[PDB]
DNA sequence: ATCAATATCCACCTGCAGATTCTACCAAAAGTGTATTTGGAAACTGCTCCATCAAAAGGCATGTTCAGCTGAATTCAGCTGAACATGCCTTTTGATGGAGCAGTTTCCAAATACACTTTTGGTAGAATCTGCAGGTGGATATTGAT
DNA sequence: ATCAATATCCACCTGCAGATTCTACCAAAAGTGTATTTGGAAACTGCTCCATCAAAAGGCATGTTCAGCTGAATTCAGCTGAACATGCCTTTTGATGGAGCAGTTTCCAAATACACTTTTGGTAGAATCTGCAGGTGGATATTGAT
């Protein structure tokens, strides 16, 4: 499923970041980084979910998880 | 018989995507990845659509920022092509490593 | 007759007081603290809305969207410093291309 | 159930831009902003009171917190607006 | 006048438990006190927040446990959850 | 008159930790197992650091743990290092580390 | 008392060199020293400013070590060994 | 007359200061610097000795950390000599500026 | 630089339709009044510890010389990654209907908060003990010239 | 492949600064007995959330071709490191007055706690509007080429 994060999508992200030329090895490096990011955020979110005896990850659980990681997000509950 | 020189369309896409705000990863592949990663932490979970949307906005903002710092590292090395060692240097200075 | 009108504020002094008592910040809460804090929240809200209304005008738009909030924040040195670890969903980034990557 | 700051943000919007509206996603961002700054100010004032072994958060704590968080500006003007609202309140 | 509390005696006890031959300079004990107060406040405030997000006015060992899992990484967390759960059931055995 | 630490099987002071929780403005009420659990976690982390630090002290032929030993213990353990990756330990110095490219060819 | 001026230059070239060494730096360009002074000065301004704000809040005239510890903790530079 | 080749004494100093923990800025000059900066912010201040000590330990820990990241930027540029643009790149990625 | 073609990009105007906005009514806060509580400001004052000052001295800072070797040009070729058009497939979209399940609401028993009385564990000094910081010796590398 | 110059160990010696232990009051844990809740354990709604269908409409995967960027190789001016002479100024030891922290009390203005009343903000079916997204048609920007 990590490979479903396609090369052209990584291209688009890079371009929003101002990147002009991309080495061919960037795509797998990017997938590895994205996966560490999601593991860290989701793990904390699901910890909030379990603490609340629910089976549904809330947007609030993600927002609190992101605020713990120092990635505060506006527009979903806080 | 028309071809733009390498670099021209790339600059054109920088100008386009720095101007829009649409998510750049496709929704369904992303949702599969999120649910798969989640399954290793707790089983048979459900996700509010807004929780998936929140994760995608977080991740895409994170990656775009990381590419900015990576690009700066590549420029620092007198290149214009980002490489894995650029991402690695940025992530190290950031304290993620 | 409300405390906000008495303070001359649009923001709700009474609610800011109930959130301070209920938020586990301290045992007691002085009478002016919710007033003061409400004033600061309304002032910062106004500052952002002003700059974002301006971005909206600058784009031939009458309704402020997230992108206008992003351009307002990132283009102001101080709001940007205050919010340098905050992500504004659907706000995008500022147009910026490194000189070295331009043609010729 | 589920109170918000939307009403007050919209009022302030009409004060500075009577001509201008706001999409609900943007109203969401304004809510996140107000809750965030609220918690920063309140948390710093909490600590301030603790370091000085006091049990009351007063406008004195809120002010020092504002000085500690906003660059100044945006802190000089915040201090202005806060002092102003408190005196207008105490003479009524 | 002007009496001030510390964790030093308890740090020193645990020290004798793990390394009976070894001492600790007061500067190193200073570091240890800062560590205990730091981690205490991280755990306590994460617990404060969990309780708030669930409209619960009480911090129970369940909160303290979720906080420890959110703060400590990996292997330190599994051992801390063990020691804490063990102490709580031993304590509730009057 | 048992102490709660004794009942819990702990060296760290359960009663004092229970008092720091009520006075700390963390929540209205504090359950009875919360201070026990928290004193347990604090004592375990103290044990883990002191273990590693004592080993550093012995590795450098010293009998008394000083800050430098605390630094080596923390920086050399991946998890204590992540736990304290934003903490500065006064008089701890740094880990001996020279980038390879800088050694003689 | 006596007028304080140009004390940043008391951060000498050999001291900056030593600090570079503990940081593993082998070769130092001649322009580093004035950069370091600039960077140090910003660091100090930000910490002392917060510390003195804590001092003023307590209606004191003496910056305590606790004031510096709290200022550093605000800046995300938590310091152990003066904390009490 | 005996002469060590350039770089040899530098490596000796890296090894030496990486074993030690003593402060590397002179005490009295630093104390003067803190007093000057503080005084240009509020007058009539006094300082606990330990407050100056805390400032120095923080400051030196900060500068040593910054020089590690700086050194990484120099090496990334296939150099060995740290330069001001290295410190600037480090501080940019760190989010200090 | 200015000939000619291919695409790109930019304005002006257009008409839906997805979201705003404006209008219409009920519990939960918000304001008031009344009666106690109490936190911490004010007024001394005991007593650390901060700012200065004197003085002698040696560890270091400053400046200078000299050349080793580093960084910054310059060149160049192989090959990596950009731009295509071509192809086919997984994402998207939008219901229907089913259901799993957050959120209410009614609980009572376990557990928490009070609140005085009785104990004792810890803190602040004296008192008693001892790692180790330097200081001096010759082993044992380590470097750098031939 | 060997000296020589110099730096680096490493172990052995020893009292002094700093630690470990010894002693007495008091703030603070503990015990016991009361009087509030808390938030769980059940039984039930209505949302929202998967699971599928079933079209098409994109958007991605693939192979071609080469432009141009990265990296390797060579040079060399001059920057920066090492070593040295000189002597300043930081350190260290120690003393002194007094600023200004911090510890006790006293005790009013301002806090929390009710109990009652009255208002507001959130909700869910009201009525328009802002821009999206397509339409041109007109310059613009790129890139090839006498």
Residue numbers in the entry:
A (entry chain B): 25 to 102
B (entry chain A), H (entry chain E): 38 to 134
C (entry chain G): 15 to 118
D (entry chain H): 33 to 124
E (entry chain D): 31 to 124
F (entry chain C): 14 to 118
G (entry chain F): 19 to 102
What does the literature reporting this entry say, word for word?
Chromatin, composed of genomic DNA and histone octamers, dynamically changes its structure to achieve correct gene regulation, replication, and repair of genomic DNA. The recent advances in understanding chromatin structure have unveiled the diversity of histone proteins, the so-called histone variants, which play specific roles in specialized local chromatin structures. Thirteen of these variants share functional amino acid motifs with H3.3 and are suggested to be subsidiary variants (sub-variants) of H3.3. H3.3 and H3mm7 differ in their amino acid sequences only at T32I and S57A; however, it is not clear how this small difference in the amino acid composition of H3 results in a marked difference in function of the nucleosome.
The diversified function of H3.3 has also been studied in active transcribed gene loci during cell differentiation or development, as well as in the centromere. H3.3 is incorporated into skeletal muscle gene promoters prior to differentiation. The overall structure of the H3mm7 nucleosome is quite similar to that of the H3.3 nucleosome. In the H3.3 nucleosome, the S57 residue forms a hydrogen bond with the R40 residue of the cognate H4 molecule. The dissociation of nucleosomes was observed for both H3mm7 and H3.3S57A under conditions of 600 mM NaCl, but this dissociation was not observed in nucleosomes with H3.3 and H3.3T32I. We found that the H2A–H2B dimer became dissociated at lower temperatures (60–70 °C) in nucleosomes containing H3mm7 and the H3.3S57A mutant compared with those containing H3.3 and the H3.3T32I mutant. After photobleaching, the fluorescence intensity of GFP-H3.3 and GFP-H3.3T32I dropped to ~10% of the original intensity and recovered to ~20% in 240 min.
